[PDB]
Write a protein that binds this DNA or RNA. Structure first.
Length: 515
DNA sequence: GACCACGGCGC
DNA sequence: GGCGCCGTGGTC
């Protein structure tokens, strides 16, 4: 042990009062180097001494620093190394338990664990040049970008949501009142246990589906959809469920999450959470804001730009299919994207839509038989033979090596590619050949975020949200159209493929208007 | 108060 | 056919 401050390039360790760095109280700050732990007397002011957040969960501490007006960029993170070695490595505890060490609740030990786990996992990346490139060029600099993004937050029209809440509440009460009549008695409509008995035991409706673990008569939307005219209560329940779903998840909780220092809504972009290399948003989740239903579109208008600013929404156009074309090298599918006609009138030479989106997931003919209503695909695979050839090629290589790769080299280990149970094996297969498609699209989006962000700062623009294949920026009205033009070009040319990457742009005062 | 499994559902 | 969060129900 040595007294604060630590020397240059030391690994950091810290303890928060809660997982959300924007709401966290920094309880303890420490730093280790050469096995020598430096503990801070007072954590908050000791942040001024550090010049780079370097260690486990570095981005989180960086977000807290940005919250306190301190410029503390995140550098190395053993979590990012482990994630590239294996996407199943998602948490410091799991990483420590796998590669040695104990993840505890003391800042000094965490700083020591960070230095060690790094040297361990860094030595494992020796010779892994494609994994090292992803670290230096994508993941490590992206953490610095996501730090600024999380600390920036998005402006939210709270008053509009408070108003919308009262409006939805009355339609919910109206629907709940009618369900009670048709049932002949009141009951908890939010309780699926109670709803099952009313529909299937009391009113005697055909119970079709059944729950997985416990085996109960399912009352899901899919099951109820077939009963939506068998009785009016089924129609009223599904309407009721949509409103309660949106109100209890978005309309009510979100206005309670406005930060007192920024006055904006702050989310967390988890960098090591998915098995494909995708990002995930939590606390709250802003990657699943409603947009489908009419009421959902109303909720999205609550997400507004600052006064004197505009939102810039950039969406990739079928990036996965374009990736699939590049990975397969299918001459026919490439020609469809290359010429620039409607991608689906051309792959028809609605039936063409569903499998052109479903082939990425391994959509069987069973669901297509139900979706398009024809009785019980092969026509598609003969139009694009290399696509089928690529799937078989990926699965074959997946069984040998034990993992599948993205374009840049991001790997996911699929163990059940040789299971003796067909349902298990074919399930793992669908996970196996989807990862290179979803992972590459994730790699492209990530790399696009890395290249674009410093261009935003130099133009006085902001990066607010990422929705897998979508970006939401914030730029002053003056620079708004210039930012949209530069951002569009950074995203489309992030990494030149055998097919061009298309991006649609949109500018507005809110998320709904811009998109 | 806290915790979690489950079903159901938003993207 | 990759995610996070809701209320319910149960437990501590």
């Amino acid at each position: 042990e040595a007294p604060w401050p630590p020397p240059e390039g030391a690994f950091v360790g810290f303890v928060l009062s809660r997982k959300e760095p924007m709401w966290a109280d920094l309880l303890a700050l420490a730093a280790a180097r050469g096995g020598r732990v430096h503990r801070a007397p007072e954590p908050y002011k000791a942040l001024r001494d550090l010049k780079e957040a370097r260690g486990l969960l570095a981005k989180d501490l960086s977000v807290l620093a940005l919250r306190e007006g301190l410029g503390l960029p995140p550098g190395d993170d053993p979590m990012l190394l482990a994630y590239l070695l294996d996407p199943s490595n998602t948490t410091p505890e799991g990483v420590a338990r796998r590669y040695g060490g104990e993840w505890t609740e003391e800042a000094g030990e965490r700083a020591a664990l960070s230095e060690r786990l790094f040297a361990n996992l860094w030595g494992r990346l020796e010779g892994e040049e494609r994994l090292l490139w992803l670290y230096r060029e994508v993941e490590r600099p992206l953490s610095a970008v996501l730090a600024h993004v999380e600390a920036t937050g998005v402006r939210l029209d709270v008053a509009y949501l408070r108003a919308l809440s009262l409006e939805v509440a009355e339609e919910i009460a109206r629907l709940e009142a009618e369900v009670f009549r048709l049932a002949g008695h009141p009951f908890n409509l939010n309780s699926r246990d109670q709803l099952e008995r009313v529909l299937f035991d009391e009113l005697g409706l055909p119970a079709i589906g059944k729950t997985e673990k416990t085996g109960k008569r399912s009352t899901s939307a899919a099951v109820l959809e077939a009963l939506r005219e068998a009785h009016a209560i089924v129609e009223k329940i599904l309407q009721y469920r949509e409103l309660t779903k949106l109100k209890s998840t978005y309309i009510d909780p979100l206005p309670e999450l406005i930060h007192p220092r920024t006055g904006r809504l702050h989310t967390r972009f988890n960098q090591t959470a998915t098995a494909t290399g995708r990002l995930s948003s939590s606390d709250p989740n802003l990657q699943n804001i409603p947009v489908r239903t009419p009421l959902g579109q109303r909720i999205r208008r609550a997400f507004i730009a600052e006064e004197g600013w505009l939102l810039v929404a950039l969406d990739y156009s079928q990036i996965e299919l374009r990736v699939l074309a590049h990975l397969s090298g299918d001459e026919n599918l490439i020609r469809v994207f290359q010429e620039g006609r409607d991608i689906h009138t051309e792959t028809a030479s609605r039936a063409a839509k569903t499998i052109n989106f479903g082939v990425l997931y391994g959509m069987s003919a069973h669901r297509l038989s139900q979706e398009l209503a024809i009785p019980y695909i092969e026509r598609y695979f003969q139009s694009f033979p290399k696509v089928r050839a690529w799937i078989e090629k990926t699965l074959e290589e997946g069984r040998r090596r034990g993992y599948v790769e993205t374009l840049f080299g991001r790997r996911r280990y699929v163990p059940d590619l040789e299971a003796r149970v067909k349902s298990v094996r074919e399930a793992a297969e669908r996970m196996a050949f989807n990862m290179p498609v979803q992972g590459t699209a994730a790699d492209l989006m990530k790399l696009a975020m890395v290249k674009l962000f410093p261009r935003l700062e130099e133009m006085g623009a902001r990066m607010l949200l990422q929705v897998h294949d979508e970006l939401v920026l914030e730029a002053p009205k003056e620079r708004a159209e210039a930012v949209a033009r530069l951002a569009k070009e950074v995203m489309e040319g992030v990494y030149p493929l055998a097919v061009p990457l298309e991006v649609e742009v949109g500018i507005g005062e809110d998320w709904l208007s811009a998109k």
